Amino acid sequence: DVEFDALLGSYCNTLSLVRFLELGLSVACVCTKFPELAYMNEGRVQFEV
Amino acid sequence: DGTGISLHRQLRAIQQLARNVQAVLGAFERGTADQMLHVLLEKAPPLAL
């Protein structure tokens, strides 16, 4: 059933569809799919000036 | 998920059934020798009787 949904219900239709990086907010937004984000305790970024 | 860790969270729980089932199916072989010493001692009249 999902073999049809990968063909039909995965693409090839909008009817009202937005992509985010289509939209022009994305110059504010770094966007990076980090899939294991559920498993993290903390997430650190170090800055040094 | 498609993450390697979610595939590896499985493997500990895969190996745990490798370690329980080999134990409890080993436990009947460990249990027959427990049963035989009872059912010998159930019919074992003590010597000097």
Swiss-Prot record, chain A:
Coiled-coil regions, chain positions: none
Location of the protein in the cell: Virion; Host nucleus
Family label: Belongs to the herpesviridae major capsid protein family.
Assembly: Homomultimer. Makes the hexons and eleven out of twelve pentons. Interacts with triplex proteins 1/TRX1 and 2/TRX2; adjacent capsomers are linked together in groups of three by triplexes, heterotrimeric complexes composed of one molecule of TRX1 and two molecules of TRX2. Interacts with scaffold protein; this interaction allows efficient MCP transport to the host nucleus. Interacts with capsid vertex component 2/CVC2. Interacts with the small capsomere-interacting protein/SCP.
Leader sequence segment: none
Gene: MCP
Disulfide-linked positions: none
Protein name: Major capsid protein
Full-sequence portion shown in this chain: 51 to 99 of 1374
Protein purpose: Self-assembles to form an icosahedral capsid with a T=16 symmetry, about 200 nm in diameter, and consisting of 150 hexons and 12 pentons (total of 162 capsomers). Hexons form the edges and faces of the capsid and are each composed of six MCP molecules. In contrast, one penton is found at each of the 12 vertices. Eleven of the pentons are MCP pentamers, while the last vertex is occupied by the portal complex.
UniProtKB/Swiss-Prot annotation, chain B:
Protein name: Major capsid protein
UniProt similarity note: Belongs to the herpesviridae major capsid protein family.
Superkingdom, natural source: Viruses
Section covered of the full-length record: 149 to 197 of 1374
Assembly: Homomultimer. Makes the hexons and eleven out of twelve pentons. Interacts with triplex proteins 1/TRX1 and 2/TRX2; adjacent capsomers are linked together in groups of three by triplexes, heterotrimeric complexes composed of one molecule of TRX1 and two molecules of TRX2. Interacts with scaffold protein; this interaction allows efficient MCP transport to the host nucleus. Interacts with capsid vertex component 2/CVC2. Interacts with the small capsomere-interacting protein/SCP.
Cell compartments where the protein resides: Virion; Host nucleus
Naturally occurring in which organism (per UniProt): Human herpesvirus 2 (strain HG52)
Its biological purpose: Self-assembles to form an icosahedral capsid with a T=16 symmetry, about 200 nm in diameter, and consisting of 150 hexons and 12 pentons (total of 162 capsomers). Hexons form the edges and faces of the capsid and are each composed of six MCP molecules. In contrast, one penton is found at each of the 12 vertices. Eleven of the pentons are MCP pentamers, while the last vertex is occupied by the portal complex.
